[PDB]
Amino acid sequence: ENAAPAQAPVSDRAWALFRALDGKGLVPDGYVEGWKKTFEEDFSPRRGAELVARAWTDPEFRQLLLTDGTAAVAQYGYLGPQGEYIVAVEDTPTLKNVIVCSLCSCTAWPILGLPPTWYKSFEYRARVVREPRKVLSEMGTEIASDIEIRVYDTTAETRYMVLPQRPAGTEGWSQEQLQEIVTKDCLIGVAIPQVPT
C-alpha cells in the first residue's frame, strides 16, 4: 500500500531517453552539450544583478525596467528561453516582493539562472504563498509586520525579477560594487542586499 513503483536507476533512465532519441537521429550533434553550456554559463543571476545596479544608478533605466522590463533586458541582450516577457517589481519602504512558481518551477532563467533546488521544493511552493513572512523569517530575512509582502505566483508567461531597495551605506559605489551585493536570492525576493561593516 502506498509503496514506490520499481524503477531503474534514474541516471540509467535519463541516458536511455537520450540514447533512444539520439539513435534515431532526432538529436542534432552537440545539441544537449550546447544546452548544458547555456544553462551553466549564460543564464546567470549575475545578469539580473547588472540590471539592478544599473537601475540603482540611472533613474532613466530604472523607469524603463519597471514599465517595460522586456525592452530594458533586450538592451543588454539578455532575453531568452523562459525570459521573453519580463516584469520587474520594485520593493519600497512599505512593500516587499517575492517570486514563486507554486505549480512547478517557473523562473526568469536568463537573468536569474535556473531555479535552485529549494525554490522547486514542495515546502516553498506550498508555504510562501500563504505565510511568506514566516518563510522569509526562517530563511534569515525579517520583514516587519507593517511592510506589505506581495507574492507573485509565476502561473503564465510573465517572468519576474525583484528590484530590491538600495541599501544605505552604498552611496557613490560603482556599478561593479553594487552588482556584487545583489545575489540570486535578492532577485527572487527572499533576501535583501547586505552591505559589509
Binding site: 533512444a20 507554486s102 505549480l103 539562472g113 529549494w118 516553498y124 530575512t141 506589505e148 503564465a156
Partner: protein, 212 residues
C-alpha cells in the same frame, strides 16, 4: 487538473531547505540532470512533437504518490519520456531495454482539453475581476486557491499566448489571449490564516469575468 501538484496553500510542510545566500551547489548536481530540459527543447523546437504546455501537463499526470516522491529533474525525465511514447516517437519497451529495468511513465490523460473560450472580456488596469468558478480536469494555469476569488487588475500583457487548457493537450483551438496580473488580498484567499499582504496571480483572460 486538481492534482497534488497544486501545492499553494497546503499545510503540514516543514522548513524550506535554504537560508539566504547559502551555497546551492552547481546548476546540475548529477551528470544526467541537463538532459530533461535539453530533450524537452529538442522535442519542442527540433521535432515539433509537443508544446511546453504539454510538458507541464504530463508532469501533472504523474501518479500522485509517484509525483510526491520524485525529485524535480526526474519528473521531467519521466514527463518527456511519456510524451515521446504518447506521440509515437519511442516505445516503452525500447526505453526499458536501454535503461535495463522499469521506466514507469505518467498516467494517460483523462481529459481531451478545452478550447480557448469564445466569450471573454478585455480588462483594464484597476478593474475588479473574479476568477471563474469552473472545474477543468485537464491542464489549467489557475491554482485552485484563486478559483472564485476576487481581485484587481495590475497589468494586462502586451503579448498574447495560446490558451493552456488547449495547447497543453496539443489541440488546434488554443487561440491567443493576453494574461492579467491579478492582485488578491491575502485574506481573500486564506481568511485569517495567512501572514502575508497580497498575492499576484498571472491569469489568462479566459479564466476571468467581471466582478459583481
Amino acid at each position: 487538473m486538481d492534482g497534488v501538484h497544486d501545492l499553494a496553500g497546503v499545510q503540514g510542510f516543514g522548513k524550506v531547505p535554504h537560508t539566504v545566500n547559502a551555497d546551492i551547489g552547481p546548476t546540475f548536481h548529477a551528470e544526467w540532470e541537463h538532459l530533461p530540459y535539453s530533450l524537452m527543447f529538442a522535442g519542442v523546437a527540433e521535432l515539433g512533437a509537443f508544446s511546453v504546455d504539454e510538458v507541464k501537463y504530463v508532469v501533472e499526470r504523474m501518479e500522485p504518490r509517484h509525483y510526491m516522491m520524485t525529485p524535480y529533474y526526474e519528473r521531467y525525465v519521466i514527463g518527456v519520456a511519456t510524451l515521446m511514447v504518447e506521440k509515437g516517437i519511442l516505445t516503452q519497451d525500447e526505453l526499458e531495454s536501454l535503461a535495463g529495468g522499469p521506466f514507469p511513465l505518467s498516467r494517460p490523460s483523462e481529459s481531451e482539453g478545452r478550447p480557448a473560450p469564445v466569450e471573454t472580456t478585455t480588462f483594464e488596469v484597476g478593474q475588479r475581476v473574479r476568477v471563474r468558478d469552473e472545474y477543468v480536469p485537464g491542464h489549467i494555469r489557475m491554482p485552485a486557491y484563486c478559483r472564485g476569488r476576487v481581485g484587481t487588475i495590475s497589468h494586462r500583457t502586451t503579448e498574447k499566448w495560446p490558451f493552456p487548457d488547449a495547447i497543453g493537450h496539443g489541440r488546434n483551438d488554443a487561440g491567443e489571449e493576453p494574461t492579467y496580473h491579478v492582485k488578491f488580498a491575502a485574506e481573500e484567499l486564506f481568511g485569517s490564516d495567512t501572514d502575508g499582504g497580497s498575492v499576484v496571480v498571472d491569469l489568462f483572460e479566459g479564466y476571468l469575468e467581471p466582478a459583481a
